[PDB]
Amino acid sequence: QSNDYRPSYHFTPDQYWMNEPNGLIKIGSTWHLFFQHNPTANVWGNICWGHATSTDLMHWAHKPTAIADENGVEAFTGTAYYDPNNTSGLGDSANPPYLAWFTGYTTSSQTQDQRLAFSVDNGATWTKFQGNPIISTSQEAPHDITGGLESRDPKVFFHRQSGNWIMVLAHGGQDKLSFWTSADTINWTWQSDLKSTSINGLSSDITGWEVPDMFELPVEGTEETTWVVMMTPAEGSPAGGNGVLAITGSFDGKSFTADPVDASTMWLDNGRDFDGALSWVNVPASDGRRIIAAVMNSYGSNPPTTTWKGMLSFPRTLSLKKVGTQQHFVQQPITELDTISTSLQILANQTITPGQTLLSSIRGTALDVRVAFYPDAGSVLSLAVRKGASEQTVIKYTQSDATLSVDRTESGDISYDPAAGGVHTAKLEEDGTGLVSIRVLVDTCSVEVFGGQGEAVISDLIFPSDSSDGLALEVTGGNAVLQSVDVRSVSLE
Numbered sequence: 392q393s394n395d396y397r398p399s400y401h402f403t404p405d406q407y408w409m410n411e412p413n414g415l416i417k418i419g420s421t422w423h424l425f426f427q428h429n430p431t432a433n434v435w436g437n438i439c440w441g442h443a444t445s446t447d448l449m450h451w452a453h454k455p456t457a458i459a460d461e462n463g464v465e466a467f468t469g470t471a472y473y474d475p476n477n478t479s480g481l482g483d484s485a486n487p488p489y490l491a492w493f494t495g496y497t498t499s500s501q502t503q504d505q506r507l508a509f510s511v512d513n514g515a516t517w518t519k520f521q522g523n524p525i526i527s528t529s530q531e532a533p534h535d536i537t538g539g540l541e542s543r544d545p546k547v548f549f550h551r552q553s554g555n556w557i558m559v560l561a562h563g564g565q566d567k568l569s570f571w572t573s574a575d576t577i578n579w580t581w582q583s584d585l586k587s588t589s590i591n592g593l594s595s596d597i598t599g600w601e602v603p604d605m606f607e608l609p610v611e612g613t614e615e616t617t618w619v620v621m622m623t624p625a626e627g628s629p630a631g632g633n634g635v636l637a638i639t640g641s642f643d644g645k646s647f648t649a650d651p652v653d654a655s656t657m658w659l660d661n662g663r664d665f666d667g668a669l670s671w672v673n674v675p676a677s678d679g680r681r682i683i684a685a686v687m688n689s690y691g692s693n694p695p696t697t698t699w700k701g702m703l704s705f706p707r708t709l710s711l712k713k714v715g716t717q718q719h720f721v722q723q724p725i726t727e728l729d730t731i732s733t734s735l736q737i738l739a740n741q742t743i744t745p746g747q748t749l750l751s752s753i754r755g756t757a758l759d760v761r762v763a764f765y766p767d768a769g770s771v772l773s774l775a776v777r778k779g780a781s782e783q784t785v786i787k788y789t790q791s792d793a794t795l796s797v798d799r800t801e802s803g804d805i806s807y808d809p810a811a812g813g814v815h816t817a818k819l820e821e822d823g824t825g826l827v828s829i830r831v832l833v834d835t836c837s838v839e840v841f842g843g844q845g846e847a848v849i850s851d852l853i854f855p856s857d858s859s860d861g862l863a864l865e866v867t868g869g870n871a872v873l874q875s876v877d878v879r880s881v882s883l884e
């Protein structure tokens with residue numbers, strides 16, 4: 392579109408198609424990113440693990456395929472982990488191995504089995520374990536009523552309290568995860584299933600369970616932690632379709648016991664385009680952040696981009712914290728973003744009234760714009776981004792029903808898919824000072840909108856013309872006092 396809508400500060404594959412991230416892991420001062428890669432760049436192409444690395448979660452260096460599809464077996468999604476005691480015996484004492492478990496998909500028969508790869512050069516190159524699969528369709532069949540066509544996406548981590556490796560497997564339309572234990576990463580034993588029917592407050596509409604992750608989260612600050620399982624069900628999300636949700640509970644090394652869930656707080660995004668989220672494991676304690684990323688493309692091959700398809704979301708932290716008196720999952724872009732952005736316009740304590748249009752001089756397609764404001768009762772604040780002649784993507788805050796909305800009815804090209812337009816909403820309240828906060832990462836073909844402390848998030852693809860690079864900040868039905876507005880441009884350099 393002049394430039395194939397390439398994002399200028401989000402990850403996209405150097406060429407061809409990406410789906411969800413895989414094997415997210417920090418090794419030394421390097422963040423590793425793998426992802427489902429389709430180099431054939433049509434719907435029938437074989438999937439492998441693509442690979443990129445960075446020191447800052449932003450400047451990515453593309454690497455060759457890490458786990459190839461081979462011998463009729465495609466390398467479907469999975470996760471990674473460090474084996475410092477060489478419990479796998481795949482490394483040695485001098486360098487314990489880094490490990491990746493992935494689903495092997497036999498294209499012709501459609502079977503799904505679990506496989507292992509290992510790296511002894513700190514994640515540079517990966518070798519498939521000679522004993523693969525480590526979990527055969529035979530082992531899966533007593534737990535998979537398709538007999539091993541629906542067992543995938545292994546999340547694996549070492550459980551200190553119990554001294555075992557833990558594998559969490561998803562089962563698609565059987566609407567459950569299974570928990571398996573191992574001492575050596577290779578020989579697994581089923582322990583339990585976590586089934587939709589067992590989770591109080593989880594709707595029947597939430598089906599097609601994929602992409603589990605599992606970790607402990609500090610539960611606010613309060614010296615206590617909790618176990619989190621995060622997954623991407625194929626149905627049931629706020630914007631409809633696939634979506635990312637998270638559930639707290641306890642874990643004893645064999646089975647997960649979920650807390651009651653609340654539909655109003657379980658989903659990690661209310662837009663269309665944030666799906667297959669994983670977190671970076673092995674993050675040193677001095678950092679201590681839970682950082683997640685997902686693919687933004689809910690439209691398969693439809694996005695009007697040619698040399699690439701699929702983009703990674705901008706990495707964001709995930710935390711549990713009280714907003715009012717409700718505990719929420721809360722997300723914010725990583726603070727590293729502040730190192731690559733520059734203010735183009737800053738407002739402090741500025742009153743906006745119906746009829747004015749602020750931010751009219753700004754031109755950019757890569758922006759990170761904060762607004763914090765005290766709206767009048769019954770006022771509607773609107774921030775139009777990627778604005779041109781007949782194009783705009785409008786973020787509104789409606790005070791009267793406390794709703795953050797993202798409206799793509801006029802974004803640009805919304806003809807590529809029936810779900811490309813419309814309006815997405817999320818609940819967002821004033822804080823106790825009356826202050827509403829909103830932050831929008833704008834890039835060539837996306838918006839990621841955070842409300843409040845990050846209790847509300849809407850991530851969506853958009854395809855405006857390149858010349859649609861204005862902003863317009865307006866208010867109707869009332870005034871607002873803009874405590875701050877910081878419009879920053881973003882550049883990788």
Ligand SMILES: OC[C@H]1O[C@](O)(CO)[C@@H](O)[C@@H]1O
Nearest residue numbers: 427467468494543544601602
């Ligand atoms: O396993 C790779 C992931 O992509 C999917 O096709 C989701 O549609 C499944 O394969 C899995 O969730």
Ligand SMILES: OC[C@H]1O[C@](O)(CO)[C@@H](O)[C@@H]1O
Nearest residue numbers: 408409410427429691700701
């Ligand atoms: O949307 C489906 C996604 O998966 C791919 O086949 C790559 O693995 C791409 O077409 C696309 O971005």
Ligand code: NA
Nearest residue numbers: 633634663689
């Ligand atoms: Na989605």
